[PDB]
Design a protein around this ligand. Structure first.
Ligand SMILES: CC(C)CCC[C@@H](C)[C@H]1CC[C@H]2[C@@H]3CC=C4C[C@@H](O)CC[C@]4(C)[C@H]3CC[C@]12C
Ligand SMILES: CC(C)CCC[C@@H](C)[C@H]1CC[C@H]2[C@@H]3CC=C4C[C@@H](O)CC[C@]4(C)[C@H]3CC[C@]12C
Ligand SMILES: CC(C)CCC[C@@H](C)[C@H]1CC[C@H]2[C@@H]3CC=C4C[C@@H](O)CC[C@]4(C)[C@H]3CC[C@]12C
Ligand SMILES: CCCCCCCC/C=C\CCCCCCCC(=O)OC[C@H](O)CO
Ligand SMILES: CCCCCCCC/C=C\CCCCCCCC(=O)OC[C@H](O)CO
Ligand SMILES: CCCCCCCC/C=C\CCCCCCCC(=O)OC[C@H](O)CO
Ligand SMILES: CCCCCCCC/C=C\CCCCCCCC(=O)OC[C@H](O)CO
Ligand SMILES: CCCCCCCC/C=C\CCCCCCCC(=O)OC[C@H](O)CO
Ligand SMILES: CCCCCCCC/C=C\CCCCCCCC(=O)OC[C@H](O)CO
Ligand SMILES: CCCCCCCC/C=C\CCCCCCCC(=O)OC[C@H](O)CO
Ligand SMILES: CCCCCCCC/C=C/CCCCCCCC(=O)O
Ligand SMILES: CCCCCCCC/C=C/CCCCCCCC(=O)O
Ligand SMILES: CCCCCCCC/C=C\CCCCCCCC(=O)O
Ligand SMILES: CCCCCCCC/C=C\CCCCCCCC(=O)O
Ligand SMILES: CCCCCCCC/C=C\CCCCCCCC(=O)O
Ligand SMILES: CCCCCCCC/C=C\CCCCCCCC(=O)O
Ligand SMILES: CCCCCCCC/C=C\CCCCCCCC(=O)O
Ligand SMILES: CCCCCCCC/C=C\CCCCCCCC(=O)O
Ligand SMILES: CCCCCCCC/C=C\CCCCCCCC(=O)O
Ligand SMILES: CCCCCCCC/C=C\CCCCCCCC(=O)O
Ligand SMILES: CCCCCCCC/C=C\CCCCCCCC(=O)O
Ligand SMILES: CCCCCCCC/C=C\CCCCCCCC(=O)O
Ligand SMILES: CCCCCCCC/C=C\CCCCCCCC(=O)O
Ligand SMILES: CCCCCCCC/C=C\CCCCCCCC(=O)O
Ligand SMILES: CCCCCCCC/C=C\CCCCCCCC(=O)O
Ligand SMILES: CCCCCCCC/C=C\CCCCCCCC(=O)O
Ligand SMILES: CCCCCCCC/C=C\CCCCCCCC(=O)O
Ligand SMILES: CCCCCCCC/C=C\CCCCCCCC(=O)O
Ligand SMILES: Cn1c(=O)c2[nH]cnc2n(C)c1=O
Ligand code: NA
Length: 386
């Protein structure tokens, strides 16, 4: 069958993906630019990721269309056409890893997050990661390429000129680079690091939530202990455990509530130390008023903040997982090409499918933000309506 027919389907699909990648990710950038509620360090990496995806549509997809034709080119110019998409994928990986680390810092040390993770430092990190992405993705242009061993028969058959090759991805980019350096070292290892970070994020959230509930139960259990105590020493034991737990939960209406709680524990402790059991128990009963009016409100707000962090971490993890799902088939095919020379090469239609799937990753993030983050979804609606 004429190659232009199957080429037409592949090219049409690539162009459709390019349009959608541009439109959706331009919308992401317009949303962060316009909405100050979206202007935080996490979303600066989101914007960097959306910029990489815009460039997939503007440059990498036109380059992929071009390299599918095998047109005659100087080999090093062919290399750039071949490898620029690896720059964008590498930049995406750095942004994804940054987002993961950012959410870990926010959940593990929220008291020093704002002083540690700043906008100026983030912009510097983004710049360094773009430079590193060019270095990693264009490493074949530094000499790790097949330009020294051109396919002269293929070039002659296509009428290429002297010093030119048929510009095809697997003819110029070495597969050992693609498998060992790009895939294993530069893609698989960072994705596994992201997995580790997300595992630590969710474990940290679950621990802080058993801790919030454990302190709440300890407060209520020790109150019952005081009510049914029969001597001052038992009242004293329970209050001492309550006092240490109250300060542990303390680490304007928030501070006042815990100021009342500790002060009321101290009142009952002094009565308990005087052997006045009934008076200490009555003073300890006043703690329930503070618990209902203040402490329970702090417990439901701390729980609410943690659940929103879990939700935001899951949204980011879905983005990272979709990157892996969209890119792994192409990398896995390269592994079969490289590691199994006795295996027939993956057919051309499957190569095209795996390439298109990798590009489709540049469409999906705007949808995840719209469905999972209300501030983005609402800002998307205002932009579209207006
Ligand atoms: C800032 C942006 C818009 C600039 C985009 C420039 C792109 C399209 C340019 C930069 C380098 C160029 C390549 C440089 C060298 C060669 C080798 C030549 O034998 C065929 C064309 C080819 C393969 C060029 C294709 C076009 C190219 C990829
Ligand atoms: C990462 C998740 C989505 C799994 C993706 C698995 C895909 C990429 C796997 C599953 C089965 C695989 C194929 C199984 C057998 C062959 C025949 C061989 O001569 C060339 C490679 C080829 C054609 C493989 C290419 C990659 C392949 C299609
Ligand atoms: C965490 C996971 C997803 C990492 C990705 C798994 C990759 C590295 C694994 C999955 C299946 C594997 C392939 C399965 C079958 C073969 C055929 C054999 O003749 C050579 C190795 C080769 C080609 C393997 C190479 C590595 C491979 C592609
Ligand atoms: C090559 C460029 C491609 C597009 C990249 C566009 C990136 C610019 C987006 C600016 C933006 O949205 O940043 C938010 C704002 O700057 C925070 O204060
Ligand atoms: C918008 C227009 C995009 C059209 C892109 C033009 C691509 C021309 C190459 C072509 O159609 O042929 C492919 C090659 O000849 C067979 O593998
Ligand atoms: C903003 C800027 C956007 C516009 C930039 C240019 C647009 C498309 C490039 C398409 C490449 C066209 C190359 C034609 C190749 C050609 O003439 O064919 C060679 C022939 O085979 C030898 O005889
Ligand atoms: C906004 C930015 C806009 C940028 C978009 C550029 C589009 C396509 C890349 C074209 C890649 C190069 C095309 C090569 C065709 C060519 O050179 O063919 C002539 C002959 O092959 C030489 O010997
Ligand atoms: C051929 C073209 C190839 C170009 C390669 C680099 C392109 C784009 C990177 C810039 C986008 C990064 C935007 C991140 C958001 C940001 O910078 O915000 C920082 C803010 O100032 C914190 O206060
Ligand atoms: C900083 C990196 C600068 C690297 C300079 C890039 C030059 C690469 C070049 O022209 O080398 C041709 C061939 O790849 C060599 O074997
Ligand atoms: C996770 C990456 C580890 C997976 C490593 C897969 C290597 C496949 C391999 O080494 O197969 C070569 C075989 O010897 C050909 O004859
Ligand atoms: C914002 C605009 C920034 C402009 C930076 C330009 C960077 C792109 C340059 C690419 C040069 C690579 C082409 C060299 C191939 C020559 C072929 C050969 O030597 O065999
Ligand atoms: C999620 C399901 C995906 C839906 C469509 C995917 C179709 C592509 C799947 C291919 C599996 C293996 C194809 C093997 C092709 C023949 C290999 C060969 O002869 O060399
Ligand atoms: C999700 C993945 C994107 C959805 C698009 C799937 C359909 C076509 C992708 C292109 C596959 C190439 C078609 C046949 C080419 C050929 O016969 O050589
Ligand atoms: C949808 C985008 C439409 C562009 C059609 C391009 C046809 C592909 C080709 O001519 O080879
Ligand atoms: C992918 C799909 C997103 C497309 C929705 C259209 C919004 C475009 C508006 C804009 O460019 O700012
Ligand atoms: C191809 C490149 C597409 C990238 C476009 C991204 C759009 C988002 C932000 C660009 C900055 C907006 C500058 C003018 C805004 C005017 C205003 O603020 O009122
Ligand atoms: C600003 C949007 C970016 C520009 C998109 C341009 C769309 C054209 C798509 C692909 C370019 C294909 C170049 C043709 C390959 C040469 C064919 C040959 O010489 O054999
Ligand atoms: C800016 C958008 C680019 C404008 C027009 C698209 C034209 C692309 C033509 C590709 C030429 C392919 C060929 O002649 O072989
Ligand atoms: C060819 C490049 C290979 C080596 C990569 C070097 C790493 C990137 C170098 C310079 C990045 C410049 C921006 C640095 C500003 C830092 C701001 C900050 O972190 O607060
Ligand atoms: C060796 C790499 C050559 C130059 C590529 C550098 C890419 C652009 C650098 C930073 C992007 C802007 C960061 C935003 C703050
Ligand atoms: C930064 C990393 C790589 C940039 C290298 C630019 C390639 C130079 C063109 C090769 C050549 O002229 O022969
Ligand atoms: C594959 C290429 C290897 C890259 C070489 C490694 C060198 C670059 C690495 C990190 C750059 C660190 C940023 C330091 C710049 C100043 C920061 C500051 O002022 O605080
Ligand atoms: C992270 C995953 C990478 C780990 C190990 C790479 C495996 C070693 C390469 C295979 C042996 C070489 C061979 O094929 O003969
Ligand atoms: C490889 C996977 C990395 C995982 C590290 C451990 C995660 C955890 O302890 O919660
Ligand atoms: C390989 C990765 C496979 C699937 C990723 C799909 C979504 C995964 C994110 C988990 C959400 C918590
Ligand atoms: C193959 C590595 C998978 C990368 C996925 C990154 C995030 C997965 C979420 C885990 C909880
Ligand atoms: C085929 C052309 C583009 C396909 C992209 C579809 C995946 C993205 C978003 C899912 C829509 C909800
Ligand atoms: C290829 C990925 C396909 C679908 C995931 C993107 C759609 C997300 C909407 C929720
Ligand atoms: C990233 N990448 C690949 O890994 C690959 N393998 C075979 N063709 C390929 N193409 C066109 C590609 O862009
Ligand atoms: Na990407």
């Amino acid at each position: 069958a004429p190659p232009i027919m199957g080429s037409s389907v592949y090219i049409t699909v690539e162009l459709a993906i390019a349009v959608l990648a541009i439109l959706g990710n331009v919308l992401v950038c317009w949303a962060v630019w316009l909405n100050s509620n979206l202007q935080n360090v996490t979303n600066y990496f989101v914007v960097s990721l959306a910029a990489a995806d815009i460039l997939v549509g503007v440059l990498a997809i036109p380059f992929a269309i071009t390299i599918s034709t095998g047109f005659c080119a100087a080999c090093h110019g062919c290399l750039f056409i071949a490898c620029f998409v690896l720059v964008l994928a590498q930049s995406s990986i750095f942004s994804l890893l940054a987002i993961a680390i950012d959410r870990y810092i926010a959940i593990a040390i929220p008291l020093r997050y704002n002083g540690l993770v700043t906008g100026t430092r983030a912009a510097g990190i983004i710049a360094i990661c773009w430079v590193l992405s060019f270095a990693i993705g264009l490493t074949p242009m530094l000499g790790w390429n097949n330009c020294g061993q051109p396919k002269e028969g293929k070039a002659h058959s296509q009428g290429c000129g002297e010093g030119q090759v048929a510009c095809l991805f697997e003819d110029v980019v070495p597969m050992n680079y693609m498998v060992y350096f790009n895939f294993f070292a530069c893609v698989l290892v960072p994705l596994l690091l992201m997995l580790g970070v997300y595992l630590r994020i969710f474990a940290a959230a679950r621990r802080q939530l058993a801790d919030l509930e454990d302190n709440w139960e300890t407060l209520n259990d020790n109150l019952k202990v005081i009510e049914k105590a029969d001597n001052a020493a038992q009242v004293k034991d329970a209050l001492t455990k309550m006092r240490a737990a109250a300060l542990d939960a303390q680490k304007k209406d928030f501070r006042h509530g815990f100021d009342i709680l500790v002060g009321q524990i101290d009142d009952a402790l002094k009565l308990a130390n005087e052997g006045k059991v009934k008076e200490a128990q009555a003073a300890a009963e006043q703690l329930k008023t503070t618990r209902n009016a203040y402490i329970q409100k702090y417990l439901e707000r701390a729980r609410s903040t943690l659940q929103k962090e879990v939700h935001a971490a899951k949204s980011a993890a879905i983005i990272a997982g979709l990157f892996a799902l969209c890119w792994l088939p192409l990398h896995i095919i390269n592994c079969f090409t490289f590691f199994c020379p006795d295996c027939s090469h993956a057919p051309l239609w499957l190569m095209y499918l795996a390439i298109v799937l990798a590009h489709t990753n540049s469409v999906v993030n705007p949808f995840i933000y719209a469905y999972r983050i209300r501030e983005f979804r609402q800002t998307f609606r205002k932009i579209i309506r207006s």
